[PDB]
């Protein structure tokens, strides 16, 4: 995610929660003051399949944090048979941020994923420090944290039907997109259910 500012990056994520699925809604454009480089590019990625981590700002830092997270992830992934939990990842991604001294991590991670092989929802955001946070309420994250959060707290229930959440999240990107200066260029919705990741590419320029 981010909670730092870049005028070389900047992107916006709002996530809201179901009860056996969690949704992450994401822009898919990239900006850089007077610069674009893609119509569509990925931000949240799997690294053990049907879990996601996003990294936002410019594209190198996105890719960097995610691979690095996998570096921490893989030892637990090998040692045990069962694939790692959501709880283990929440601390791990935080440990990655924590590795740096005084000038912390270049992106400021928000994690969304179902607990492996079981249907337990998780949403968390983190700060760029090592400050431990447990969250499972709702999370919105970006530079303008308050703006992703007010709408993402508003839309759900802690038991809607999956579809109702997906239509909510599509709209969630649109009212957000009017709220930012121009930052857009395609909208991606990710619903994480049990073993399947629903990906949707919304219409626009």
């Amino acid at each position: 995610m981010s909670v730092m500012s870049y005028n070389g990056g900047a992107v916006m994520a709002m996530k809201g929660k179901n009860c056996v699925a969690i949704a992450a809604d994401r822009r898919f454009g990239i900006q850089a003051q007077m610069v674009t480089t893609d119509f569509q590019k990925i931000f949240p990625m799997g690294d053990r399949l049907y879990i996601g981590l996003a990294g936002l700002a410019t594209d190198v830092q996105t890719v960097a944090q995610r691979l690095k997270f996998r570096l921490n992830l893989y030892e637990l992934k090998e040692g045990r048979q069962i694939k790692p939990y959501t709880l283990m990842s929440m601390v791990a991604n935080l440990l990655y941020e924590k590795r740096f001294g005084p000038y912390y991590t270049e992106p400021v991670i928000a994690g969304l994923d179902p607990k492996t092989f079981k249907p337990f929802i998780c949403s968390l955001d983190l700060i760029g420090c090592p400050m431990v946070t447990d969250d499972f309420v709702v999370s919105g994250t970006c530079s303008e944290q308050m703006y992703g959060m007010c709408e993402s707290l508003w839309e759900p229930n802690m038991d809607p039907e999956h579809l109702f959440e997906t239509i909510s999240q599509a709209m969630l990107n649109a009212v957000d997109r009017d709220a930012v200066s121009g930052m857009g260029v395609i909208v991606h919705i990710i619903e994480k259910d049990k073993i399947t990741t629903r990906t949707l590419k919304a219409r626009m320029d």
Partner: protein
């Protein structure tokens, strides 16, 4: 000022899947103390010979049943100094896991990392690998586990295994015998009976030492308690 002496390989491959000098280390653990470990399937219990056969033993904390952390305990057979370093190293490793994960080190992982130093000492000149074998317990994944790490650095996975005097004979008796679905109290009773079969001589409560791992956490049983279990069973 400076030290040299011995820095060429001391270890030569034998066609057996192991080197000569490590094979000899496994005899060392056999002449070591009797230690038995059985996974009860609702916790793991590990029992060790308290004595070093002077039969003046006055334990209150000087044990060979040691909690590393919240849910990991170690009992060993073989060498004393070689063991103390593994205990000091284990806490640092458990905590290394505790910092990143906010849970301490699984059984499998702790084994991989301890095993790498034990091999290090083999290949290198001017060092010798440990003379210690570990019975490592833990509660991870929602299941109790028990691993055996040998003085070589090789690992053999066991639900029940025995070390010390008559270890070889100990493994076959366990392989046939091993039990699961055991109540906590029963766990102790089975563990003591298996210890009777490995260990010779007198058992009272300053001759054998027992520690249990379960859901509440690893702790080390008081000398009064061990005695009550010992009496109970045939």
């Amino acid at each position: 000022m400076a030290e040299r002496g011995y820095s060429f390989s001391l270890t030569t491959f034998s066609p057996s899947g192991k080197l000569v000098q490590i094979e000899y280390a496994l005899a060392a653990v056999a002449g070591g103390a009797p230690s038995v470990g059985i996974k009860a399937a609702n916790g793991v219990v590990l029992a060790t010979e308290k004595k070093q056969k002077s039969i003046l033993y006055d334990e209150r904390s000087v044990h060979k049943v040691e909690p590393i952390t919240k849910h990991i305990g170690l009992v060993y057979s073989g060498m004393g100094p070689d063991y103390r370093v593994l205990v000091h190293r284990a806490r640092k490793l458990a905590q290394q896991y505790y910092l990143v994960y906010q849970e301490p080190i699984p059984t499998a992982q702790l084994v991989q990392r301890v095993a790498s130093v034990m091999q290090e000492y083999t290949q290198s000149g001017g060092v010798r690998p440990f003379g210690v074998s570990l019975l490592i317990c833990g509660w991870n994944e929602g299941r109790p586990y028990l691993f055996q790490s040998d003085p070589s650095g090789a690992y053999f996975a066991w639900k029940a295994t025995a070390m010390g005097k008559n270890y070889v004979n100990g493994k076959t008796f366990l392989e046939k015998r091993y039990n699961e679905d055991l109540e906590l109290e029963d766990a102790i009773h089975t563990a003591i009976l298996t210890l009777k079969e490995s260990f010779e001589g007198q058992m009272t409560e300053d001759n054998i030492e027992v520690g249990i791992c379960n859901e509440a956490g690893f702790r080390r049983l008081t000398p009064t308690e061990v005695r009550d279990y010992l009496a109970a069973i045939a």
